[PDB]
Amino acid sequence: DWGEVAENLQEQTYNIYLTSNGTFRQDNEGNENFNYWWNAHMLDVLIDGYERTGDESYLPKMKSLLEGIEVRNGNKYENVFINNMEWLGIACLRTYKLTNDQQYKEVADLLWEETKQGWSDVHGGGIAWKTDTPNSKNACSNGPAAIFALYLYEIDQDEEDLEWAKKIYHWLKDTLVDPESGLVWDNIDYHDGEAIINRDWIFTYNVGTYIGAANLLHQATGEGMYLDDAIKSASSVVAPGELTTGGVLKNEGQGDGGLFKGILVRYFTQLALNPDLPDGKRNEFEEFVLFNAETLYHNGLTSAGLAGPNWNDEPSGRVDLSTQLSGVMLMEAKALLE
Ligand SMILES: OC[C@H]1O[C@H](OC[C@H]2O[C@H](OC[C@H]3O[C@H](O)[C@@H](O)[C@@H](O)[C@@H]3O)[C@@H](O)[C@@H](O)[C@@H]2O)[C@@H](O)[C@@H](O)[C@@H]1O
Ligand SMILES: [Ca+2]
Ligand SMILES: [Ca+2]
Ligand SMILES: [Ca+2]
């Protein structure tokens, strides 16, 4: 029972990482630092549990987390990293779609206004990484911005938001997507006076949000090109290459990188749920999530239920919250697909 596994991990995560004010600590050792974007993804994990169970017990924990983020972020929701605001805004819109709780919509509305301010024509378009890095346009600040815009379009049907989604996605595809594989390069910035793309950094979460944005744009327009884009990127995830070792999504370390795998699995799974996906691709994608979930469960989880950065080995020491969230996201995705 994969839902039973996910619920066990939800409980272990909440029990080990909950700190004051309804937020979640950086690790299970000596660090109580508040990580804004990690806590945003804990909200996503709590939403995963709510959708699977229908258990209203998740709702007060979600609300306490939303309000605790405001306090620990300095009595505000704005953050210097634009991608951080995008992650929280996405989770807030997800919550509003399921609960109609206007408090989440108001936060999302604020964060969308800030996200749109990061856009510029530097490097041809794209949302900046930070409010003060006008020249650094990163996949992690554009993939999520498109997803953000698409959720808002589903909710408010403002034509300007669909235009934003299309413009963000098409800049991302034209700039940071490898035309041969569909995988996503990390960023473009000025180095020694000229624009350079970091092609060495190919992370699971960047192709993850590209897949997620393409899937949502296909749903919002019906244009097959978006589905073709998503299938190509997801097929490269499955086939041997940069992001897998022995068919398992690879170790990307702890800290921020601990969260990368879970984000890819979330949006990969959403593509596997698209009704227009061909049967053979759906089977291949479902089998890939199962293989990863089985690997983590049997090889990578501690007996208490903590996941490490390598899904194929148990962590012997500190477990960052980000790393743990990727494990819970994997199990929730597996339970969703059964
Ligand atoms: O070794 C450096 C980092 O490499 C890997 O992270 C890749 C990303 O690094 C940057 O983003 C990191 C964090 O920056 C802010 O705090 C905020 O935006 C956070 O949300 C963000 O995660 C940036 O260059 C991104 O474009 C890269 O993709 C991981 O291994 C990290 O853990 C590691 O510290
Ligand atoms: Ca429970
Ligand atoms: Ca209920
Ligand atoms: Ca305030």
Numbering used by the authors: 54 to 391
The authors write:
The marine bacterium Salegentibacter sp.
We generated two double mutants, D136A/D137A (ShGH76Ala) and D136N/D137N (ShGH76Asn). We hence repeated the dot-blot assays with structurally modified (linear or debranched) yeast α-mannans. We solved the crystal structures of ShGH76WT (apo-form), ShGH76Asn (with Man3) and ShGH76Ala (with Man4) at 2.0 Å, 1.47 Å and 1.9 Å resolution, respectively. C 3D-crystal structure of the ShGH76Asn mutant in complex with mannotriose (Man3: yellow stick) displayed in cartoon format with gray color showing single-domain (α/α)6 fold viewed along the barrel axis with active site in the center. Despite repeated attempts to co-crystallize with Man5, the crystals of the double mutants ShGH76Ala (D136A-D137A) and ShGH76Asn (D136N-D137N) were only obtained with bound Man3 and Man4. Co-crystallizations with Man3 and Man4 show also a kinked position of the terminal non-reducing mannose residue that is unknown for any other GH76 so far.
